[PDB]
Amino acid sequence: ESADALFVGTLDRLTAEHPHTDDPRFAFQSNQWNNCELRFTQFCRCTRELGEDDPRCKYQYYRAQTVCHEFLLEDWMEHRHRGTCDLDIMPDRQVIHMRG
């Protein structure tokens, strides 16, 4: 309700209420690749917590589509289904802190 409610809670909310507008974290740059990757990671984390059938995660996918072209999503969604998507590996099976 509050006028600044969107900024309150998360920076994510801003684009969730206005899907086709600039995200505060990426509005400074015309290139929106990083924006797409954040949105996909957020869809991946939603399903892990709520499942695919949850309306929330379905909307997190619509939000990802708003910024990600279909040819990228289809490829990244196949990697996710196989279990090779680097944005969805469970954190205890990551290797980012190993050997350096």
């Binding site: 900024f7 801003l14 206005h18 505060p24 974290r25 990426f26 400074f28 990083n34 990671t41």
Partner: protein, 186 residues
């Protein structure tokens, strides 16, 4: 500029002076083989390059260009949200990079952007305020300027109150016209 080697040249103290330049000018020189000849060649170069009035204009231009250049480089590294030198945030997924997201909004609103955006009405005839209103709040609401951009904008009147058609071309009157037809919301 003295013409006799007996008459000394005045030098300030510091790292860029007549004495400092003399010490280093002939380091790589095969032609300055004795004091008399060395001094003659040194004064010849100083007379030709440092007593030339127009040469100082280029000194100003190199300083200005280089100063801008160094600063734009530094600004990117220090403030641009997309330039990473530290690695903490690069070892995390995008949703978790809070410290880097803090640079975003401050970097999105530089002073000159706020100062010069109102002057779009000197480049657009129809609906120069088409993009002024934005309900989100990432940027300030924009108000059109009251005067033309100083310089080469003679085609528009010096002040927009002088222009007869300015008010009728605003996005507000255009919205009124189209809303009366049911044509569009904006």
């Amino acid at each position: 500029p003295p013409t006799r080697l007996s008459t000394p040249l005045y030098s300030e103290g510091g790292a860029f002076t007549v004495n400092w330049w003399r010490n280093r000018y002939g380091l790589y020189s095969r032609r300055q083989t004795d004091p008399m000849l060395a001094e003659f060649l040194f004064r010849q170069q100083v007379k030709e390059w440092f007593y030339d009035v127009p040469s100082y204009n280029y000194a100003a231009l190199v300083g200005l260009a280089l100063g801008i250049l160094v600063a734009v480089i530094w600004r990117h590294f220090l403030f641009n949200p997309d330039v990473y030198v530290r690695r903490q945030e690069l070892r995390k997924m995008w949703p978790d990079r809070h410290r880097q997201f803090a640079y975003a909004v401050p970097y999105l609103n530089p002073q000159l952007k706020n100062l010069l955006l109102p002057y779009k009405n000197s480049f657009i005839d129809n609906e120069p305020d088409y993009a002024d209103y934005n309900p989100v709040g990432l940027r300030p609401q924009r108000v059109m300027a009251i005067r033309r951009i100083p310089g080469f904008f003679w085609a528009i009147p010096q002040y927009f109150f002088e222009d007869p058609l300015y008010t009728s071309c605003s996005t507000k009157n255009m919205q009124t016209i189209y809303k009366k037809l049911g044509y569009s919301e904006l």
